[PDB]
Amino acid sequence: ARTVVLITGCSSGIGLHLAVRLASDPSQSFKVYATLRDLKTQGRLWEAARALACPPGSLETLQLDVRDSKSVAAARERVTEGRVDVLVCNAGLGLLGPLEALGEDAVASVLDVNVVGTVRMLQAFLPDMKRRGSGRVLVTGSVGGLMGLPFNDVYCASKFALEGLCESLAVLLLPFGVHLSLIECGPVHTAFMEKVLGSPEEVLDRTDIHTFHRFYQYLAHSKQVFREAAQNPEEVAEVFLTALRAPKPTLRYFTTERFLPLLRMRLDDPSGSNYVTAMHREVF
Amino acid sequence: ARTVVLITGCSSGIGLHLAVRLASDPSQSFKVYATLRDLKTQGRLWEAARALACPPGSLETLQLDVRDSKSVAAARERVTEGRVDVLVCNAGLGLLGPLEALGEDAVASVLDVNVVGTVRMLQAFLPDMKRRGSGRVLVTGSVGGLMGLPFNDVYCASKFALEGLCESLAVLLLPFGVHLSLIECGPVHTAFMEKVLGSPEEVLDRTDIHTFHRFYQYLAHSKQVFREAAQNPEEVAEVFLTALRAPKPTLRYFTTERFLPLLRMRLDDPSGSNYVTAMHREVF
Ligand SMILES: C[C@]12CC[C@@H]3c4ccc(O)cc4CC[C@H]3[C@@H]1C[C@H](Cc1cccc(C(N)=O)c1)[C@@H]2O
């Protein structure tokens, strides 16, 4: 009857704006479960829900920790309709800084949440989609999963992993009628790079002066790129809707064509030397 | 005086054949620390050492668990010369099977060892290489880190992550004089896909009949690809030597040109549709 949509990571950003956008829909086609790690962060989701005046019953919140498969099961249990038509894997963690300055727990956590937690969603939800012979999976990707960035080593590691995970799955799912797509985001203006980085004080402690100086230069350049390229989460959310609406989804949707030149140069010098050279000069 | 080389994962395969190859070297240029998770598995490394008659003192073994940063530190401590000229990150875990058939621990472990453990090596060893303004890092990569394969979802996830990790680092390390390179391997005939997969009995338990059948078809095709394309670890080891010897290493060395067509098609249809189509028919 309604298309049932479960989204992870709805407390801010792309996930919040997509949950209520679908909400929301003048057509009333969508029943949305918006999941969040901490319910104390659900205020903005319910504010924004009021702003776009979502109908009553359009939006149910669930608590869901993607690092915890019992929590993934308990959120799956609470899906009354007993199917999910559109699973959106969007919960994600950032990590920014000199590699030797990152705590090993913080490294472990990004991988846990960004890769393993996506795996846990797909394990809990894919079986029944394959049995039904239908279902859409959308995954928040990043242009940092398509080309490496200085000081984003671990974030890019995590983002690249999702490409590996999802491309491998797509090759299998083709004849099942289950559709998986990555929505590849450039910079998005939400609230992103926040406490994804330690204090200058603590970062200097953990690295050399020359590396520290380079981090500042990367930050200056990143601020510039964001101010000249950063997209709306509203703009980003339409791309998810385009994929969810397509009769035969491709593997990747790009929310911006802007980085495609740069990605072309990675990909026709397989040695990686052109990319690394171009990016070094771009950043520094 | 001698080039000090520390390699991870030497109990078999590429790591074992590279440790003693360098060994070994009629020139006697190399002092090798060959690390292994379990010392009980060091027999083959010392057999092969006798076969290629490595000189006395050419090869020291260390125990090293890459999942454990105290173990990474204790192996670093035991490097008497007090520098490492060539760090080789080669320790790796496989995982093969339908995604829903993989244990969550087994998923966590592959990421821990293949990504986090590489991070731990680089944290322990990169600081002093940057201070010296010199050092080579070589990382075992796979063609499964460059394109996704059905039933290799998690392995490819891990392998893709290493591309993300290393490309991000290379962009920073360029003006430091520290050189990082991936050695991208196709199928290698060692002993690989062993207990990287559960029994047919246990896998059928954990999946549908149609997915199970497809797994068999992928295995049949994989056996064929290996029998028609699989390289020596001796052949693979020369590629590492080529990179270690290059005055200005590129980011990636390919031990085979054979998959480069296939990689070209990933990369000029950014939607991923051509790749996924070509590979689906290639495999099934
Ligand atoms: C990778 C990227 C697209 C490419 C951008 C680029 C392109 C070209 C260039 O020359 C410079 C730059 C710098 C900025 C880059 C963006 C960073 C942003 C990702 C990010 C990082 C840390 C935490 C989070 C989080 N909270 O989710 C998100 C976005 O995904």
Ligand SMILES: C[C@]12CC[C@@H]3c4ccc(O)cc4CC[C@H]3[C@@H]1C[C@H](Cc1cccc(C(N)=O)c1)[C@@H]2O
């Ligand atoms: C990915 C790959 C290169 C591309 C190959 C290919 C290409 C084209 C094609 O059509 C089919 C196939 C099937 C075989 C594929 C290889 C599998 C092998 C990796 C592997 C897997 C599980 C555990 C370990 C471990 N113990 O380390 C290693 C190698 O790296």
